[PDB]
Homo-oligomer: 377 residues x 4
């Protein structure tokens, strides 16, 4: 019907009421949330999505939907600190062991980490501060040949740059707090089900055994959105990481301009990267969009429109130069979250999430940081 | 400082040129929020606790209350008189996480609680008033068994509210509410809250997570933080990792409900009492469950633990089983079939002739007139 | 059929909370705001209501729906300061002359102020800081025998205490900012049409002439809610004092406990009034609920359940500075008690729903 | 300090707390102002380069307050006849009842007509920078020059252009009005109006005694003595105080959020609208297209001078088959909304004989064009 719509059309209209041509159902007796779920699914080309209280809860649910006590996960070591803390501390206490591969670019390393109780592979499509790209097709190929699904976090790339289901991923997670909502005004997470994975190959008896908690349903018999439905009826029901309808409303409102924002974030980031790479007082820049990045060729293949809005770089003067540089910035925020419209310092490496301000104001602000770092030759 | 205020004053001012609460609708600590902080402090003040943690839902509050103490290989002892959502959490989702929840046969038998104690038991759990039984938990008695084994007692105080029972004064260590219900009061904001009594010694030996430097959080030893150790641990570990965060807008809405809590519970309770009496006096009603009725086995317990009343939920049995009850609920014109317990709106839900009501704050005579419609309809069966 | 209590939750409404139609799509009605209007109309017993950006806009619309340049209004001098400013300054600029009777208790003064171009009488059912009660039946019969409608502001009394349509008023105005919303969280006004006035008697050709701005409609031929409908399709359309659906939602939330809050505000205020009257260091107390008030007997007739929650008293700057619980900034009609020291020893209170003993404790700190 | 910032920086940062580096909703009635609303006022004023702004309940209220701040009973306004129907209704019906006479010039491009309508009681000139359905541009410098030589201020409504395309204070306007409901908020989610004071007009020349006489309603203040923002301050302390057209803080929050992407949205609205215009102009079954961005428009040269980045997102056109063709065309559209407001991100039909009026959204251009083809297939039965 509307599958052929462009991205731009979808970010406004996908999931809308069939007679629209968005009321906040702030009730505990959800239609507001369902629209935002349908819209995000449509942007990723997934079959269904589940909107939740935060990105942390989305990562939690993505894992817990498959794994419990005595189960195992294989993860890239290149992780957001909040995901690492979840995997390494709180999940370990629930009897889920998360192993990290030595080098996520080494496909043999993923294979070697596979164990009989492994329930998923996990990685981030673009990680920070490295600004690598995951080899989603190659990692997915290893997972699938073992009967294991691949979960990826696509927060930094967004669906505008990468639709990982087209690359082999089975489950996509976003911190909607960040780019999807875009305005720093609503904490939210979302899990998107690709509907690409066969749940009946052996490792997932919870998908093939009648669930006495829910009318004896066998989730795999629900077809493509099995995983998403199971997460809603078991995890959301029991663990209760529900999204406020008001937050759903706000994220839907931010989604209406997603492509426009990402286009500007990305062109600003590319320019900041290039600016930095050309300076004598910068030792190195990490940004896949630069010709010299080790992941630039991969970016041309997997993410041709750009490599997100986050970058990092090292100053010649080391740790003290880095501190002096960041503490001198006036326009860059020190309190904003990645994925806001605002430029910010992410809390000798300096880490920036580049905003949609005027590029000349952004570069003038960075010159303040360079002036401050100058005392630390 | 202001611990001496009345409940009425606290519900408006506790935690606070007094005025309405602004909404910090912002994701820029990310582990606190000025709007939510105030609601936490207020709910803590109303229960007489030392700290509280406000969350996405009541379900998440139950979840966090258990997970803050128990992980894979651990054990919990619960009353079998449980809200369906808590039952499912305990029996399905926690089991998956390696946590065994054992239910006592009869929660009024204190020896049964003792007998269920195991070396890996990490808490006792019960609801101060359960539904549809409308019993009261023997909070003092159950607490005493828990404490003599070095175990804390967690209670859900949702139906009673802090206006009727402050369980910390009866031996509970941790209190959970679905703030979705009575606390917010208007059916407008899904939310949960955990309140820490600060009355339990975490160093007796079952809780090495409280006595061991935490590598995730600067080597802090939670027990050394004193009275609010449990609340702080839950925030810095569980909310941090698991992310059952509340929207600041939902906290604002709950605050707005809190401002009238005691007024609303007073009328919910006076109405519910009258509905119960009304029902107990009818010949086409087989039995009524409600602790405020003299005939209830928990009536005397209510006089000691909850003298102002026994909440606003009740149930009762009709002569004709399922079929009389189906047409009873189908005839009501004022009672909602979709509103949540703890809304201002009366609601109805269908022993096979068992009808369950959460009595609202509508005019009593309108409520009773509406029920007569139900009786008439059921009398075709 | 339904009691006030059931109406404040269900009037206008598988009952559940009101959704928020936060949207500018199609435009001069909104489903969230519609419910709050019907609800408030049900509580006052009117035929229709119109919910607006503020009480000031409600006063403004209530006059401008009837009067334009070259017209006249007769008003009580016992007015809220914002209404006085509107009447005396802004409306004068628009060529509307507002005249104030010397004594609003003097029914013959009302009669004497009538002019050929007079388009309404106005008064407040309970005024502040005097805490009189308007003689609504008596002012209304003076108005009506001259072919003129009575507009009253019922903000302080609320519909829980007085339903002025029962006493001869034709239009009622509230600052829903105050007691209706109840929580200091939503600026709003409302006009309620009693549907009790014949608009065709001669002073109102705007009601008996086809409106070329609106399909030649003759507003009087719409029957009972002619006034409310006219205000919506002309004034709201053109002047644009619209309420946010979010503010309507917040006021609906407050309405759900209105009777409960007013009951408590009024027993607290009644007790605070009585407290204050018993004290040798207090010269006088204004509160119609006190047996000594000149308006006490009128209160028994027109407001038997009590006389609002606002009061004032004269002392023999220090008193307020000592208060720790009373807010200096909360608006009248918030849950929070409010104090003001503007007689040169006059103190003004809006008594909240805090515990009465804490309120009186806080006042005792005042007396020091 | 932050004047040199680009438009893009300002739409995010102008008016922010000075320590925001190291937007709460003050939904409190504790009272002619609010920090949430003040941020949105300062940000809009910065985008226009004005000295102050006043944010209000709706665009209708902003038009109302912009006139009533200057005119009461027995006063006069000169207006362009090219007006939004909501403004015309206000001017012609409600303000007329308040004793305010609004005259319309026959042709707003004839500067001598503006002069000829000036009366001793004239308090303002009014026009829209781009009107709809004509999609002309007001001759803001020439109209301003006439106003000013008579000691009269020029009020313009800059809603359709937005501050991204035109800053009318740079072209002689003194007061700017927006329906913030539309493009400023951008998401069809908050009704609002705003009045922006240019700080560019001398109020002491003779026609404005309300600005040079002590006001007993407000401490004997002489508004002109407050300097540049006299007009905005007077509107706040008199009209907002008395007439009460206040904005909900929640609405201000929502508009502030939409402002964060203003330039980006307007860029895409405008390049979409230019493509739709060219597409229509090239069709045999379209008789004419009104859009200033087209070379054929009588206002295209004026656009090149006054609005070089483009001419808004609204257009109109006439179909060959007249009125039935136009109705068939609009009724067949599936993606265009029939209920959204101008200035939403959504494409919509806005409600000569066969005239179709569109506000072009930021959807994918190919999808917008395919939807219009539904309309052309429907119109085919009316040649």
């Amino acid at each position: 019907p509307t599958a052929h719509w462009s991205f731009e059309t979808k970010q406004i209209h996908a999931g809308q009421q069939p007679d629209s041509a968005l009321p906040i159902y702030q009730t505990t007796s959800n239609p507001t949330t369902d629209v935002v779920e349908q819209r995000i699914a449509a942007l990723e080309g997934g079959v269904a999505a589940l909107f939740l209280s935060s990105g942390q809860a989305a990562e939690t649910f993505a894992i817990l939907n498959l794994a419990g006590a005595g189960d195992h996960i294989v993860s890239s070591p290149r992780l957001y600190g909040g995901t690492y803390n979840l995997f390494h501390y709180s999940l370990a206490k629930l009897g889920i062991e998360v192993s990290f591969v030595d080098d996520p670019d080494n496909l043999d390393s993923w294979q070697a980490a596979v164990r009989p109780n492994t329930k998923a592979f996990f990685g981030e499509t673009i990680s920070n501060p490295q600004i690598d790209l995951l080899d989603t097709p190659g990692v997915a190929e290893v997972a699938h040949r073992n009967g294991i699904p691949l979960i990826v976090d696509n927060t930094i790339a967004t669906p505008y740059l990468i639709r990982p289901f087209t690359q082999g991923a089975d489950i996509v997670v976003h911190s909607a707090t960040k780019y999807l909502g875009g305005h720093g005004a609503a904490i939210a997470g979302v899990i998107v089900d690709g509907g690409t994975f066969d749940w009946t190959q052996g490792r997932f008896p919870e998908f093939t055994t009648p669930d006495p908690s829910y009318h004896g349903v066998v989730f795999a018999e629900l077809g493509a959105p099995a995983y998403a439905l199971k997460a809603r009826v078991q995890l959301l029901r029991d663990l209760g990481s529900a999204a406020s309808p008001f937050n759903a409303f706000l994220v839907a409102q931010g989604l209406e301009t997603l492509s426009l924002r990402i286009e500007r974030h990305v062109s600003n980031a590319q320019r900041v990267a290039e600016f930095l790479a050309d300076r004598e007082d910068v030792v190195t820049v990490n940004y896949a969009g630069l010709p010299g990045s080790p992941w630039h060729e991969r970016a041309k293949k997997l993410s041709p429109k750009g490599t997100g809005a986050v970058l990092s770089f090292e100053l010649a003067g080391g740790v003290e130069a880095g501190k002096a540089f960041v503490n001198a910035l006036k326009l860059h925020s020190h309190v904003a979250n990645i994925g806001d419209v605002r430029s910010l310092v992410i809390h000798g490496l300096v880490r920036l999430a580049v905003g949609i301000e005027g590029i000349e104001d952004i570069l003038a602000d960075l010159e303040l940081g360079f002036a401050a770092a100058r005392k630390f030759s």
